[PDB]
């Protein structure tokens, strides 16, 4: 069915990919409507042990905030490639085990700094063990125009260098991977 | 010569600034209105402006600085570096590979150039070629530890965990007291999976932790490896009971890490 991507989720995802340009990055979307976003890793994404730890932390953090893990985003390092590799499909498929309607979002991290006219994203849905792109009419945006401009202005203010993902948190566990300085509001 | 401008360019170079906007703004003003006065600093400033122009999207200015530098220092390694940077910024990846290839023909162990070729191959989606090229290099320069680490990471990206584990064994054998290589070796063996790999992973996570008691990745890995071992039916009751002990030891160490972290973070927010 339809999925509404919130401003906060889209911005933090873009800020993640922009803090680590030219790297693959991934993350999770949460929903009670994709309302929030947990940036995951920017290196060695295909190793499973810290991903396992991250999935559990966000699950119980979500469960206490009345949220469920509802999606996964992934930006490929290859610049012409917006198609999900086996890692993206594996993780997204596992997430759909606990949430059948989960979405897999491929992010074009090449179309970020000049924010394009149309969202630089492909949204895929689970269709019996295969992931297939959603009809574009089924993907809705809470003020797409406003989400465009805030990413531009916040990147201009180097705000992405204050963005914390789980990799950063592992380096120093005092760092907040919920990014509670969501001063974008 | 406006001293305010020439000295600002000095401290920006010395402090490795990232303010490409201001560096282009002052530097371009210096090239066009005060070149007669810059004296000895002219060529560094030309190079400084070119780099910042590339990142700020002033390719007209970058090309001018590049052409002038090429004229003053023909054949130089540093102009080649700038030429390669420009090709990369324009996504002229093939031209970039050609440039980095003849640097490495003059210096097979050049680390910067090899590192640039690897980034380009990832941008190109040619990780497989990158793996073949790193292998050819390591057959002739087996002592290059950083190149072994680059290859390890390439194999992980390609999900070839046994080959990555092999590369990390070279790094552990040459750096037996480096906690990071033990920790990454353990993550790779954990990902390969199975009880035997999981027992191995627990042990190297324990070695990384003993090598550096503050490696959070090692602590979590020890907990996660030990907990899976303790729930695996194949394991002995001796191995299971021993790993249940490892896991709630790890769990309480994890429990304590977050409290010390959380108390430290509140002394930080209270200035």
Author numbering:
A (entry chain B): 2 to 33, 42 to 194
B (entry chain A): 11 to 281
Share the article's original sentences.
More recently, the ten-subunit ‘ER membrane protein complex’ (EMC) was shown to insert TA proteins whose TMDs are insufficiently hydrophobic to effectively engage TRC40, the mammalian homolog of Get3. The membrane subunit EMC3 is in complex with six other integral membrane EMC subunits (1, 4, 5, 6, 7, and 10) that together contain 12 predicted TMDs. The seven membrane subunits of EMC associate with the cytosolic subunits EMC2, EMC8, and EMC9.
Recombinant cytosolic subunits and subcomplexes were screened for crystal formation, resulting in well-diffracting crystals of a nearly full length complex containing EMC2 and EMC9. The EMC2•EMC9 structure was solved with experimental phases from a single-wavelength anomalous diffraction (SAD) experiment using endogenous sulphur atoms for anomalous signal. An initial model was built de novo and subsequently used as a molecular replacement search model for a native crystal diffracting X-rays to 2.2 Å. EMC2 is largely alpha-helical and contains a curved tetratricopeptide repeat (TPR) motif buttressed on one side by EMC9. The core of EMC9 consists of a small β-barrel flanked by alpha-helices. The ~1100 Å2 EMC2-EMC9 interface contains a network of hydrogen bonds and salt bridges, explaining its high stability in vitro and the absence of any appreciable free population of either protein in cells. EMC2 and EMC9 both contribute to the formation of a large, relatively shallow and moderately hydrophobic cavity that we term the cytosolic vestibule. In this experiment, we used a substrate that contains only the TMD and a few flanking residues (termed TMDSQS), allowing us to be sure that the crosslinks are to the TMD. These findings verify that the cavity can engage substrate TMDs and map an approximate binding site that spans both EMC2 and EMC9. A combination of H189E, L190E, and Y191K (termed HLY*) in the region of highest substrate crosslinking showed reduced insertion by this assay. This vestibule is constitutively open to the cytosol, is shallow, and is only moderately hydrophobic.
